[PDB]
Amino acid sequence: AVQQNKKSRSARDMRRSHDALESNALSVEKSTGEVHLRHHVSPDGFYRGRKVVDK
Amino acid sequence: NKIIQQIEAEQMNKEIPAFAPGDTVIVQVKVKEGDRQRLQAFEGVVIAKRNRGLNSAFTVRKISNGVGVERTFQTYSPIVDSLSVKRRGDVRKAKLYYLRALSGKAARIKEKLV
Amino acid sequence: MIQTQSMLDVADNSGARRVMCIKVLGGSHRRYAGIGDIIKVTVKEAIPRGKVKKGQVMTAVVVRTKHGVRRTDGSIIRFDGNAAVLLNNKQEPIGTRIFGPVTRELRTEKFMKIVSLAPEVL
Amino acid sequence: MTIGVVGRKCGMTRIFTEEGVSIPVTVIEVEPNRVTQFKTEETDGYRAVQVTAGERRASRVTKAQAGHFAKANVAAGRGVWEFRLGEEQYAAGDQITVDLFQAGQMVDVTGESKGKGFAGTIKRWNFRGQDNTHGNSVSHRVPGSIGQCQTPGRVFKGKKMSGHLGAERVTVQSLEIVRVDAERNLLLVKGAVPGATGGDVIVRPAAKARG
Amino acid sequence: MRHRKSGRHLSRTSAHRKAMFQNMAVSLFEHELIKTTLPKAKELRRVAEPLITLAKEDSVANRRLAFDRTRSKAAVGKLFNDLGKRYANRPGGYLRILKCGFRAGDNAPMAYVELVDRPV
RNA sequence: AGGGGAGUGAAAUAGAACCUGAAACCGUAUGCGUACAAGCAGUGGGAGCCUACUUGUUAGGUGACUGCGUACCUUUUGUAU
RNA sequence: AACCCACUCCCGUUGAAAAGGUAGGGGAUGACUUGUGGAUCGGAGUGAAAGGCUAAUCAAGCUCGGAGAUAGCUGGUUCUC
RNA sequence: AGGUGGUCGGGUAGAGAAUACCAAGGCGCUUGAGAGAACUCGGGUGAAGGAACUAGGCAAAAUGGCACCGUAACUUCGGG
RNA sequence: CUUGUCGGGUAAGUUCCGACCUGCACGAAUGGCGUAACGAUGGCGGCGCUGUCUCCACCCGAGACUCAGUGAAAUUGAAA
RNA sequence: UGUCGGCUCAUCACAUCCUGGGGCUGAAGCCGGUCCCAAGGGUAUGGCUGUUCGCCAUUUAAAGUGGUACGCGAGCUGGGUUUAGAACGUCGUGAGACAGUUCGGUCCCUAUCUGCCGUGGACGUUUGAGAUUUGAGAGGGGCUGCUCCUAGUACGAGAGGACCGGAGUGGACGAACCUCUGGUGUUCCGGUUGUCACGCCAGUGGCAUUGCCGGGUAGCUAUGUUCGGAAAAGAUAACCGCUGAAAGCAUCUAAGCGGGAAACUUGCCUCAAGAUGAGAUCUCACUGGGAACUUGAUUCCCCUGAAGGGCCGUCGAAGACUACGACGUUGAUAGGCUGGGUGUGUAAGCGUUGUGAGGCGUUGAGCUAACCAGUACUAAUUGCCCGUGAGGCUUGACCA
Ligand SMILES: [Mg+2]
Ligand SMILES: [Mg+2]
Ligand SMILES: [Mg+2]
Ligand SMILES: [Mg+2]
Ligand SMILES: [Mg+2]
Ligand SMILES: [Mg+2]
Ligand SMILES: [Mg+2]
Ligand SMILES: [Mg+2]
Ligand SMILES: [Mg+2]
Ligand SMILES: [Mg+2]
Ligand SMILES: [Mg+2]
Ligand SMILES: [Mg+2]
Ligand SMILES: [Mg+2]
Ligand SMILES: [Mg+2]
Ligand SMILES: [Mg+2]
Ligand SMILES: [Mg+2]
Ligand SMILES: [Mg+2]
Ligand SMILES: [Mg+2]
Ligand SMILES: [Mg+2]
Ligand SMILES: [Mg+2]
Ligand SMILES: [Mg+2]
Ligand SMILES: [Mg+2]
Ligand SMILES: [Mg+2]
Ligand SMILES: [Mg+2]
Ligand SMILES: [Mg+2]
Ligand SMILES: [Mg+2]
Ligand SMILES: [Mg+2]
Ligand SMILES: [Mg+2]
Ligand SMILES: [Mg+2]
Ligand SMILES: [Mg+2]
Ligand SMILES: [Mg+2]
Ligand SMILES: [Mg+2]
Ligand SMILES: [Mg+2]
Ligand SMILES: [Mg+2]
Ligand SMILES: [Mg+2]
Ligand SMILES: [Mg+2]
Ligand SMILES: [Mg+2]
Ligand SMILES: [Mg+2]
Ligand SMILES: [Mg+2]
Ligand SMILES: [Mg+2]
Ligand SMILES: [Mg+2]
Ligand SMILES: [Mg+2]
Ligand SMILES: [Mg+2]
Ligand SMILES: [Mg+2]
Ligand SMILES: [Mg+2]
Ligand SMILES: [Mg+2]
Ligand SMILES: [Mg+2]
Ligand SMILES: [Mg+2]
Ligand SMILES: [Mg+2]
Ligand SMILES: [Mg+2]
Ligand SMILES: [Mg+2]
Ligand SMILES: [Mg+2]
Ligand SMILES: [Mg+2]
Ligand SMILES: [Mg+2]
Ligand SMILES: [Mg+2]
Ligand SMILES: [Mg+2]
Ligand SMILES: [Mg+2]
Ligand SMILES: [Mg+2]
Ligand SMILES: [Mg+2]
Ligand SMILES: [Mg+2]
Ligand SMILES: [Mg+2]
Ligand SMILES: [Mg+2]
Ligand SMILES: [Mg+2]
Ligand SMILES: [Mg+2]
Ligand SMILES: [Mg+2]
Ligand SMILES: [Mg+2]
Ligand SMILES: [Mg+2]
Ligand SMILES: [Mg+2]
Ligand SMILES: [Mg+2]
Ligand SMILES: [Mg+2]
Ligand SMILES: [Mg+2]
Ligand SMILES: [Mg+2]
Ligand SMILES: [Mg+2]
Ligand SMILES: [Mg+2]
Ligand SMILES: [Mg+2]
Ligand SMILES: [Mg+2]
Ligand SMILES: [Mg+2]
Ligand SMILES: [Mg+2]
Ligand SMILES: [Mg+2]
Ligand SMILES: [Mg+2]
Ligand SMILES: [Mg+2]
Ligand SMILES: [Mg+2]
Ligand SMILES: [Mg+2]
Ligand SMILES: [Mg+2]
Ligand SMILES: [Mg+2]
Ligand SMILES: [Mg+2]
Ligand SMILES: [Mg+2]
Ligand SMILES: [Mg+2]
Ligand SMILES: [Mg+2]
Ligand SMILES: [Mg+2]
Ligand SMILES: [Mg+2]
Ligand SMILES: [Mg+2]
Ligand SMILES: [Mg+2]
Ligand SMILES: [Mg+2]
Ligand SMILES: [Mg+2]
Ligand SMILES: [Mg+2]
Ligand SMILES: [Mg+2]
Ligand SMILES: [Mg+2]
Ligand SMILES: [Mg+2]
Ligand SMILES: [Mg+2]
Ligand SMILES: [Mg+2]
Ligand SMILES: [Mg+2]
Ligand SMILES: [Mg+2]
Ligand SMILES: [Mg+2]
Ligand SMILES: [Mg+2]
Ligand SMILES: [Mg+2]
Ligand SMILES: [Mg+2]
Ligand SMILES: [Mg+2]
Ligand SMILES: [Mg+2]
Ligand SMILES: [Mg+2]
Ligand SMILES: [Mg+2]
Ligand SMILES: [Mg+2]
Ligand SMILES: [Mg+2]
Ligand SMILES: [Mg+2]
Ligand SMILES: [Mg+2]
Ligand SMILES: [Mg+2]
Ligand SMILES: [Mg+2]
Ligand SMILES: [Mg+2]
Ligand SMILES: [Mg+2]
Ligand SMILES: [Mg+2]
Ligand SMILES: [Mg+2]
Ligand SMILES: [Mg+2]
Ligand SMILES: [Mg+2]
Ligand SMILES: [Mg+2]
Ligand SMILES: [Mg+2]
Ligand SMILES: [Mg+2]
Ligand SMILES: [Mg+2]
Ligand SMILES: [Mg+2]
Ligand SMILES: [Mg+2]
Ligand SMILES: [Mg+2]
Ligand SMILES: [Mg+2]
Ligand SMILES: [Mg+2]
Ligand SMILES: [Mg+2]
Ligand SMILES: [Mg+2]
Ligand SMILES: [Mg+2]
Ligand SMILES: [Mg+2]
Ligand SMILES: [Mg+2]
Ligand SMILES: [Mg+2]
Ligand SMILES: [Mg+2]
Ligand SMILES: [Mg+2]
Ligand SMILES: [Mg+2]
Ligand SMILES: [Mg+2]
Ligand SMILES: [Mg+2]
Ligand SMILES: [Mg+2]
Ligand SMILES: [Mg+2]
Ligand SMILES: [Mg+2]
Ligand SMILES: [Mg+2]
Ligand SMILES: [Mg+2]
Ligand SMILES: [Mg+2]
Ligand SMILES: [Mg+2]
Ligand SMILES: [Mg+2]
Ligand SMILES: [Mg+2]
């Protein structure tokens, strides 16, 4: 099955009105001042005020 | 389920002497034909046993008149007036469903003497 | 439960050994016959000088079934085979003896005769 | 109907009578209900009573709800339900227990049925399948035809298709009360009740009833 | 439907799953800290923590039972000698899971799994 | 990789895929319109708003609301077909 | 069994494949299967014969010429008054 | 996932170059991670019936080895 | 004509088997009538067996679904 | 513009097959015939044949007649029919033919728009928010047998055998559920074959369709369990009337007043204020300055952001993704741990007996998924973003 008519410029842009992206929840580790993902270990290696992996 | 266990616990007062699959038991069932109250005996080997508190059940098999018959009893039902173990058998399994394909000398259960 | 083309043996001395169900009576689109249910059978195998013949269409009542029958307390009674009793035009047994046990739900108004003839009632 | 209680489905059990009969029974715990608001002809239009049961944390109760539960000194419970009463008098603060029911007393039970996710036409509408052999091509549980040709030439509204055997509300009518346990706050009802264990159920006198 | 069922299929046969989690448990007891996928880490704690509890008492039958579940002499040696003695008074929860972002290759969520009282 | 400056040149939006660089097609910014409304999407009437300036019998941009209105070619006695 | 074949179902049909795959199936010391080299061809060859095969093309191969064959038949035919 | 001539070809079971688990040797097949709807594909188990299915027992299920006993009509005297 | 008529097989048989002869329109090397063995050959009937079916249920893998990367196709006068 | 029949799924008409209500009868009763009203719900399984049909067998209350591209192949099939092979009869000298037989013979498409079944995002509902609701409207449902009592009564010479009214138990269909009866249960426990490995013995593990098997928890599930169709009211259809003239009588009608059916409107269940006519009730939150005007439902700047919502995390009998529901340390949300329960069925090691396989004891042992109860041991942070600052105007009545 295929279209009998080609879609218009407006018609295919209304379908894409739901394609936007959402942002993530970011937090600032107050001990260091570093931005990280919420509930995740920072790229440095801190979580909730403690060293976990130390690179 | 904590309070369902208490509903069921008030209905469990019968004694129910211990028995095992493979045992030969005699069950006294209550029959109420008309207004009279008599007891009928059902004797056979216990092939299965279901241990679920008030929902306990067991199955006994016998050869009546050349026809095999199996009855599943609800242990705590008032229909089961009493129970007695005529003989004890020596088996390795919990369910003896293989006995249905054996007829005569092949379906004999060895006895547990000790 | 019995349906069309189920094979079941005879609990009588009417001369038939095997009968085959060809109709389950008592209702449109009815599917199964249990203990105490009337069916329509055809004789598939018979004794040389019995009182029924091979290829004969007649009425029977189911007396003993493999599926079983359940009681009011939850218990169930099962047998190792399906058996029937052949009936005449006025719904009475054709044979004079009955072989094997029967069940207490056969003690209706019209089947009390075959309950009394059975060696055992369960 | 017109008055009832809100309970929780505890599960199923059995009781044996002295004659040797097993009764299938559903156990319903009815924590005592507290009257939160009474509605009359003049104040609200229709006429009903508002009820809450259970408990909720202080942190899960909003300020709008907390002040509603403080006009009637009731304390917060889980959920709020309403019963449309014919002609009864209640005040904000009364208790409603298992005591308005007795043995006998055909009742109706409402609940949220168990949810199947996305069901096909065989399970949802009791359709019958095509052949499993004899040359069938990848069309064993498919619905089949859904309409007719040029005439109307569309699908009629209400056509039975697949999707979401629901977690809907359903009522079961004319169930018999077997036992009322006043000190344990239990209703024993003969039969099955919609929902799973721990769900919310509403018990009311049978609408039809009669016989 | 899946009502009240436990366990993840993880797109593997049940024989593949048994071997894979048996490999992770041996690695965790030796390296004391591993990095894996978040769904896999949440299924590993139902396999490796029963093994630590089993090792809290030393006997021939227990060391045989541990070997049948981890076919590794070193892993059975690490238990019954270091673990189980370290966690003698700890009533459960011998390991910890911490989310640590996503992989570049497939954007798979990742987590760390480590024992609670590492000597480091 | 690609850029931002600096330099050469009369001219780098002449920078090597290098004269000029149109159309289809894809974007960013501004103005007006558009979420109770039925159809060849225009045409006749027409309020409101915005811009410019000659400050309203003006010019430009939008077009709420409303009357009328079933593409083009070919082939045919005859096509919205 | 290998090897040669191709009777059935299903899948696949925009295929992994312009004829396959998984399950089953037939012959399997012979009128057998197969490698290398060679001979016969376009009104001609070859054919345990199906009008089959002759380079994914066969009731007369492909290629280049006669050649812009002929087409009472379809289609199209471009600015203005 | 096609086709392609010839040579070598171990151990334990096995008549065997079948088949299964291994050796020497080689590989995990160039998108992954989740979750566990309908439906499709390839499979496992199924109460009581047992061909009622269908154009048709299609498909599936079933049988299956070695030794010994025993084996009908018919026959071209081999067979079956 | 025709599902000819009779018999058998089935509870019920336009198919099958045995006959009848009224051969629309058989017939003797475009061979006639039989025939053991043989056939991935056509028709019919039984035993066993079964999810073929009454009437479907549960379970296991690969897709379908969501996330990250790459990235087609037939079709299309214009569409409020 | 794919042509028969079958399967799956349907929708409408009434010229009604059953059930419902009536008139006449050459209607004693039980049964019938015919006509009128009525479309709510129902309305077989097989043997033969490619068959629709038909004929048979056995049921049922009944096995209705038609329209929908003789409904339905971008839903399935491919037996019939109409390609290419082969044969029979007949026709033709022949190539060949037959609307005559017979055997064999490839059924493609990832759904754009309308449509339909589910499930969301945005905005609106005139300050915003948490919760509970009314019901304009719309869907679902509506079937029926047999037995017993009335009563062997009415009726009838007898045989036979009721209306009206009441009680029980079935078939088919539908919903919910898992206490029971079972199925499944490659996540639990055992038996066993071949082979490889853990140094070896013992004991275990990989592979062989889960290697093959025997059981089986939770969940799901039917074949298991429970429930349902109503009663009742209103307005009527055919039909039966009361009173009553025109037309001194008669007459259901012209005025007026009744009875009357599974059809219609309610009553039973579900959805339902996007019902833009966007409804109602309870409670909660916000009570600061300045500047420019194109001087009021205006714009800009500083301060202040509440009630609440979301992101995120731990999950769920909720689920395609969503949405919905519970919880986030002041916590039992998930995992573990501790007890129990359930299933399987007497582990290992050791000691005895035996030349050995094996037996016996310690021992109903050991192991045990999803279940029940408890317990902060592990994971749910100490966060960010939206949402503001008292809610226009006109008219009337109360009020000061
Ligand atoms: Mg289109
Ligand atoms: Mg077109
Ligand atoms: Mg649109
Ligand atoms: Mg998109
Ligand atoms: Mg449900
Ligand atoms: Mg669910
Ligand atoms: Mg079917
Ligand atoms: Mg096919
Ligand atoms: Mg195909
Ligand atoms: Mg298939
Ligand atoms: Mg179509
Ligand atoms: Mg139309
Ligand atoms: Mg439908
Ligand atoms: Mg769980
Ligand atoms: Mg395996
Ligand atoms: Mg310069
Ligand atoms: Mg330029
Ligand atoms: Mg230039
Ligand atoms: Mg260029
Ligand atoms: Mg130049
Ligand atoms: Mg240029
Ligand atoms: Mg351009
Ligand atoms: Mg744009
Ligand atoms: Mg713009
Ligand atoms: Mg409107
Ligand atoms: Mg508008
Ligand atoms: Mg439109
Ligand atoms: Mg104008
Ligand atoms: Mg203008
Ligand atoms: Mg206009
Ligand atoms: Mg206009
Ligand atoms: Mg117009
Ligand atoms: Mg024309
Ligand atoms: Mg024409
Ligand atoms: Mg046109
Ligand atoms: Mg015209
Ligand atoms: Mg056109
Ligand atoms: Mg080869
Ligand atoms: Mg196959
Ligand atoms: Mg093959
Ligand atoms: Mg072969
Ligand atoms: Mg041969
Ligand atoms: Mg050669
Ligand atoms: Mg040559
Ligand atoms: Mg030529
Ligand atoms: Mg030919
Ligand atoms: Mg060539
Ligand atoms: Mg070729
Ligand atoms: Mg010329
Ligand atoms: Mg030319
Ligand atoms: Mg033309
Ligand atoms: Mg070898
Ligand atoms: Mg062998
Ligand atoms: Mg091999
Ligand atoms: Mg090697
Ligand atoms: Mg995956
Ligand atoms: Mg799956
Ligand atoms: Mg399948
Ligand atoms: Mg199977
Ligand atoms: Mg099983
Ligand atoms: Mg079965
Ligand atoms: Mg079993
Ligand atoms: Mg069976
Ligand atoms: Mg059989
Ligand atoms: Mg048949
Ligand atoms: Mg049939
Ligand atoms: Mg076959
Ligand atoms: Mg097979
Ligand atoms: Mg023979
Ligand atoms: Mg003929
Ligand atoms: Mg004939
Ligand atoms: Mg005949
Ligand atoms: Mg046949
Ligand atoms: Mg001659
Ligand atoms: Mg001839
Ligand atoms: Mg002959
Ligand atoms: Mg041959
Ligand atoms: Mg033959
Ligand atoms: Mg037959
Ligand atoms: Mg993607
Ligand atoms: Mg078409
Ligand atoms: Mg159908
Ligand atoms: Mg109509
Ligand atoms: Mg009519
Ligand atoms: Mg008529
Ligand atoms: Mg009728
Ligand atoms: Mg009628
Ligand atoms: Mg009449
Ligand atoms: Mg009707
Ligand atoms: Mg009808
Ligand atoms: Mg209707
Ligand atoms: Mg109607
Ligand atoms: Mg009605
Ligand atoms: Mg039929
Ligand atoms: Mg029929
Ligand atoms: Mg046929
Ligand atoms: Mg119709
Ligand atoms: Mg018409
Ligand atoms: Mg017609
Ligand atoms: Mg048609
Ligand atoms: Mg039709
Ligand atoms: Mg098709
Ligand atoms: Mg068709
Ligand atoms: Mg198709
Ligand atoms: Mg179409
Ligand atoms: Mg299709
Ligand atoms: Mg054909
Ligand atoms: Mg065919
Ligand atoms: Mg031909
Ligand atoms: Mg001739
Ligand atoms: Mg063939
Ligand atoms: Mg043919
Ligand atoms: Mg359209
Ligand atoms: Mg209404
Ligand atoms: Mg509407
Ligand atoms: Mg209605
Ligand atoms: Mg309706
Ligand atoms: Mg009714
Ligand atoms: Mg019916
Ligand atoms: Mg039912
Ligand atoms: Mg159901
Ligand atoms: Mg159950
Ligand atoms: Mg259970
Ligand atoms: Mg070794
Ligand atoms: Mg050993
Ligand atoms: Mg082994
Ligand atoms: Mg290996
Ligand atoms: Mg197995
Ligand atoms: Mg086997
Ligand atoms: Mg088993
Ligand atoms: Mg098992
Ligand atoms: Mg089982
Ligand atoms: Mg279960
Ligand atoms: Mg009169
Ligand atoms: Mg009068
Ligand atoms: Mg008068
Ligand atoms: Mg009047
Ligand atoms: Mg609203
Ligand atoms: Mg509102
Ligand atoms: Mg707040
Ligand atoms: Mg909320
Ligand atoms: Mg979830
Ligand atoms: Mg939430
Ligand atoms: Mg606590
Ligand atoms: Mg817990
Ligand atoms: Mg435990
Ligand atoms: Mg136990
Ligand atoms: Mg022992
Ligand atoms: Mg031991
Ligand atoms: Mg063991
Ligand atoms: Mg002992
Ligand atoms: Mg135990």
UniProtKB/Swiss-Prot annotation, chain A:
One of its GO terms (molecular function) is structural constituent of ribosome. InterPro entries: Ribosomal_bL32, Ribosomal_bL32_bact, Ribosomal_zn-bd. Keywords: Ribonucleoprotein, Ribosomal protein. One of its GO terms (cellular component) is cytosolic large ribosomal subunit. One of its GO terms (biological process) is translation. Residues 10-21 have a biased composition (Basic and acidic residues). Pfam families: Ribosomal_L32p (PF01783). Residues 1-55 are annotated as: Disordered. Belongs to the bacterial ribosomal protein bL32 family. This is Large ribosomal subunit protein bL32. It comes from Pseudomonas aeruginosa (strain ATCC 15692 / DSM 22644 / CIP 104116 / JCM 14847 / LMG 12228 / 1C / PRS 101 / PAO1). The lineage of its organism: Bacteria, Pseudomonadati, Pseudomonadota, Gammaproteobacteria, Pseudomonadales. The gene is rpmF.
From Swiss-Prot, chain B:
PROSITE patterns: RIBOSOMAL_L19 (PS01015). Keywords: Ribonucleoprotein, Ribosomal protein. Pfam families: Ribosomal_L19. SUPFAM superfamilies: Translation proteins SH3-like domain (SSF50104). The keyword Zinc does not apply. GO terms for molecular function: structural constituent of ribosome. It comes from the Bacteria. One of its GO terms (biological process) is translation. One of its GO terms (cellular component) is cytosolic large ribosomal subunit. Signal peptide: none annotated. The keyword Ribosomal protein applies. Gene3D superfamilies: 2.30.30.790. PANTHER family: LARGE RIBOSOMAL SUBUNIT PROTEIN BL19M, RIBOSOMAL PROTEIN L19. Belongs to the bacterial ribosomal protein bL19 family. This protein is located at the 30S-50S ribosomal subunit interface and may play a role in the structure and function of the aminoacyl-tRNA binding site. This is Large ribosomal subunit protein bL19. It comes from Pseudomonas aeruginosa (strain ATCC 15692 / DSM 22644 / CIP 104116 / JCM 14847 / LMG 12228 / 1C / PRS 101 / PAO1). The gene is rplS.
From Swiss-Prot, chain C:
CDD domains: Ribosomal_uL14 (cd00337). Binds to 23S rRNA. Forms part of two intersubunit bridges in the 70S ribosome. It comes from Pseudomonas aeruginosa (strain ATCC 15692 / DSM 22644 / CIP 104116 / JCM 14847 / LMG 12228 / 1C / PRS 101 / PAO1). Gene3D superfamilies: Ribosomal protein L14. The gene is rplN. Coiled coil: none annotated. This is Large ribosomal subunit protein uL14. Part of the 50S ribosomal subunit. Forms a cluster with proteins L3 and L19. In the 70S ribosome, L14 and L19 interact and together make contacts with the 16S rRNA in bridges B5 and B8. Pfam families: Ribosomal_L14 (PF00238). One of its GO terms (molecular function) is large ribosomal subunit rRNA binding. GO terms for cellular component: cytosolic large ribosomal subunit. PANTHER family: 50S/60S RIBOSOMAL PROTEIN L14/L23 (PTHR11761), LARGE RIBOSOMAL SUBUNIT PROTEIN UL14M (PTHR11761:SF3).
Curated annotation (Swiss-Prot), chain E:
The keyword Transferase does not apply. Pfam families: Ribosomal_L17 (PF01196). GO terms for biological process: translation. Keywords: Ribonucleoprotein, Ribosomal protein. InterPro entries: Ribosomal_bL17, Ribosomal_bL17_CS, Ribosomal_bL17_sf. SUPFAM superfamilies: Prokaryotic ribosomal protein L17 (SSF64263). GO terms for molecular function: structural constituent of ribosome. GO terms for cellular component: cytosolic large ribosomal subunit. Belongs to the bacterial ribosomal protein bL17 family. Part of the 50S ribosomal subunit. Contacts protein L32. This is Large ribosomal subunit protein bL17. It comes from Pseudomonas aeruginosa (strain ATCC 15692 / DSM 22644 / CIP 104116 / JCM 14847 / LMG 12228 / 1C / PRS 101 / PAO1). The gene is rplQ.
